Amino acid sequence: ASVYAWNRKRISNCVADYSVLYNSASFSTFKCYGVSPTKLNDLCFTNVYA
């Protein structure tokens, strides 16, 4: 969708693997702010937003 109509999705009740996202080279910019990119496999959250 357009930038002024950005598409929002809620993710819950799942087992997420961020390693497969991080190791891929398809992404030009991979910038995480509040957490370290390599520690995402060691944390548990709820109500993720994309």
Place this chain on the structure above:
Amino acid sequence: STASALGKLQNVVNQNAQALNTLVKQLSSNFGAISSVLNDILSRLDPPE
């Protein structure tokens, strides 16, 4: 019969207890950081910050 005649010792004890209580309560302040518990900071982000 009459109580509250020993206010000085009570005041000393109360002052000591209050000082200890505020000292232990001070541990729950952010001080401008992202968290008040050190384990979360250690386990959530990469050392250089």
